[PDB]
């Protein structure tokens, strides 16, 4: 219970995404290992680009 | 880095490029970070792969304008897919700009006459980038 | 010693004008470092990105005719590897083409010192010029 | 530094046709011994 | 001193004729007087006068073929700056 939280805690820190963006399956995989990091005090940013690049390399037509 | 592609390195700044400049460049700084989180992010690319895929762009002033100044009329979104191309592109990113130094003592030749103890220094600019025209629109994200 | 290589040709005066013309008309586009930092010569981005940069190339000196990404090295063999003449002018590719084949003869010229022998580790070339070897940087990288 | 203010000096008036490009190739030839023993092996006048 | 800076080119004579042809042929054209007097460089409105311009040059050299706006400084580096080879013939942005 306290994973999930965790987790959408994370989501609104990254970017403010909206759960619609929530369910895109890059995401979807990727929230749980940004759930496993962030407790430390890494950085917001850091997230922010590795979305960045990950969403990128996910969309290769 | 190969041993020809370093050599040709640097022949090509330390001679082709100042002889046909007359010295006229500049060494730039940048962070990517701000640079990338303001070009986009915003709308069109956390689209969620409907969106995305036939979106019009944000049209902001900071790309679009950048993309116009590349090419003038031609365009119907001003985009035609270049922004799909570049944030393809972007997986490939890097630090930011860094300033090395470099203590290194010369050849054995030149160490020998009481010279062991002198020190070359050498400033390196690390993932930087030379520059050669007064940049304006960027003038947030790039140090000279 | 251009006598003494018999490397003396004029072949690159007409190129070295239209280089010295775009090096110097202070009118150079902005997103052309945005792409020297995006790639970095890596070439899976510059193969991504072959035909944003086919397409600014191809405005670029073929209206502005002022030659473009004649700013970073791997930028510039890139450029003559991997971008044909498909989608860009022709007369752009050989001064491409013509650019790395003057840092060819400019490494010919003065590596006639070549003499097979070290003396401590290091080749006697090294030894003769301080452009080859481990001593000067390329005061512009990317990677190390 | 490796290059001090003459190859700036020079490279602020030489003329753009590959001699000034040649020739910065050549100023940074050195002036180690071992430099002036292959020189004069290669019948290439130094600076003295 | 022209020895002396080693700068001696022989890049500019078909320029030069050109220039001084537009200089001396005494029939240039009314409305780039009002342009010079509108625009004065500060390049928004130059931008807003970008397609004027561009049919002026283009006509008047593409016809009279005498070069156009070659009196205003302010005027004639701003050819340089921003216009494009796309508005005005390339023989005529060459010599800008």
Same mark, same amino acid.
């Given at each position: 219970?306290?994973?999930?939280?965790?987790?959408?805690?994370?989501?609104?820190?990254? !970017?403010?995404?909206?759960?619609?963006?929530?369910?895109?399956?890059?995401?979807?995989?990727?929230?749980?290992?940004? $759930?496993?990091?962030? %407790? %430390?005090?890494?950085?917001?940013?850091?997230?922010?680009? =590795?979305?960045?690049?990950?969403?990128?390399?996910?969309?290769?037509? | 880095?190969?041993?020809?592609?370093?050599?040709?390195?640097?022949?090509?700044?330390?001679?082709?490029?100042?002889?046909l400049?007359?010295?006229?460049?500049?060494?730039?700084?940048?962070?990517?970070?701000?640079?990338?989180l =303001?070009?986009?992010?915003?709308?069109?690319?956390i689209?969620?792969?409907?969106?995305?895929?036939?979106?019009?762009? @944000?049209?902001?002033?900071?790309?679009?304008?950048?993309?116009?100044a590349?090419?003038?009329?031609?365009?119907?979104?001003?985009? +035609?897919?270049?922004?799909?191309?570049?944030?393809? #592109?972007?997986? *490939?990113?890097?630090?930011?700009?860094?300033?090395?130094?470099?203590?290194? @003592?010369? =050849?054995?030749?030149?160490? &020998?006459?009481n010279?062991?103890?002198?020190?070359?220094?050498? &400033?390196?600019?690390?993932?930087?980038?030379?520059?050669? +025209?007064?940049?304006?629109?960027?003038?947030?994200?790039?140090?000279? | 010693?251009?006598?003494?290589?018999?490397?003396?040709?004029?072949?690159?005066?007409?190129?070295?004008?239209?280089?010295?013309?775009?090096?110097? +008309?202070?009118?150079?586009?902005?997103?052309?470092?945005?792409?020297?930092? /995006?790639? &970095?010569?890596?070439? &899976?981005?510059?193969?991504? /990105?072959?035909?944003?940069? #086919?397409?600014?190339?191809? *405005?670029?000196?073929?209206?502005?005719?002022? !030659?473009?990404?004649?700013?970073?090295?791997?930028?510039?063999?890139?450029?003559?590897?991997?971008?044909?003449?498909? /989608?860009?002018?022709?007369?752009?590719?050989?001064?491409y083409?013509?650019?790395?084949?003057?840092?060819?003869?400019?490494?010919?010229?003065? @590596?006639?010192?070549?003499?097979?022998?070290?003396?401590?580790?290091?080749?006697?070339?090294?030894?003769?010029?301080?452009?080859?070897? %481990?001593?000067?940087?390329?005061?512009?990288?990317?990677?190390? | 530094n490796?290059?001090?203010?003459?190859? +700036?000096? *020079? @490279? $602020?008036?030489?003329?753009? #046709?590959?001699? #000034?490009?040649?020739?910065?190739?050549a100023?940074?030839?050195?002036?180690?011994?071992?430099?002036? $023993?292959?020189?004069?092996?290669?019948?290439?006048?130094?600076?003295?």
């Amino acid at each position: 219970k306290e994973e999930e939280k965790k987790k959408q805690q994370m989501l609104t820190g990254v !970017l403010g995404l909206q759960p619609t963006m929530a369910n895109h399956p890059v995401l979807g995989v990727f929230l749980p290992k940004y $759930a496993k990091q962030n %407790g %430390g005090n890494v950085d917001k940013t850091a997230f922010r680009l =590795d979305l960045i690049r990950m969403l990128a390399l996910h969309r290769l037509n | 880095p190969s041993n020809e592609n370093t050599i040709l390195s640097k022949i090509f700044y330390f001679c082709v490029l100042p002889a046909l400049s007359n010295n006229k460049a500049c060494g730039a700084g940048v962070n990517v970070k701000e640079l990338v989180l =303001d070009l986009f992010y915003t709308e069109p690319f956390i689209c969620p792969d409907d969106c995305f895929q036939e979106n019009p762009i @944000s049209s902001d002033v900071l790309m679009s304008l950048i993309r116009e100044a590349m090419g003038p009329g031609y365009t119907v979104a001003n985009t +035609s897919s270049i922004a799909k191309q570049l944030f393809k #592109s972007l997986i *490939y990113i890097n630090e930011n700009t860094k300033i090395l130094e470099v203590e290194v @003592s010369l =050849d054995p030749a030149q160490r &020998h006459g009481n010279s062991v103890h002198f020190q070359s220094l050498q &400033h390196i600019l690390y993932n930087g980038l030379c520059l050669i +025209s007064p940049i304006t629109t960027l003038r947030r994200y790039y140090q000279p | 010693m251009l006598e003494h290589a018999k490397t003396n040709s004029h072949n690159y005066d007409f190129t070295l004008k239209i280089v010295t013309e775009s090096l110097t +008309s202070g009118s150079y586009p902005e997103l052309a470092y945005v792409i020297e930092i /995006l790639v &970095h010569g890596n070439k &899976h981005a510059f193969m991504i /990105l072959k035909q944003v940069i #086919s397409q600014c190339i191809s *405005y670029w000196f073929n209206m502005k005719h002022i !030659l473009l990404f004649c700013n970073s090295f791997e930028m510039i063999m890139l450029i003559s590897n991997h971008m044909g003449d498909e /989608l860009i002018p022709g007369a752009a590719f050989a001064h491409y083409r013509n650019l790395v084949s003057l840092i060819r003869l400019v490494k010919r010229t003065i @590596s006639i010192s070549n003499i097979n022998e070290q003396l401590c580790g290091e080749p006697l070339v090294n030894f003769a010029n301080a452009l080859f070897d %481990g001593r000067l940087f390329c005061p512009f990288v990317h990677t190390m | 530094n490796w290059q001090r203010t003459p190859f +700036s000096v *020079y @490279s $602020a008036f030489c003329p753009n #046709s590959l001699l #000034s490009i040649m020739t910065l190739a050549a100023m940074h030839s050195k002036l180690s011994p071992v430099a002036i $023993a292959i020189q004069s092996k290669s019948k290439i006048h130094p600076g003295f």
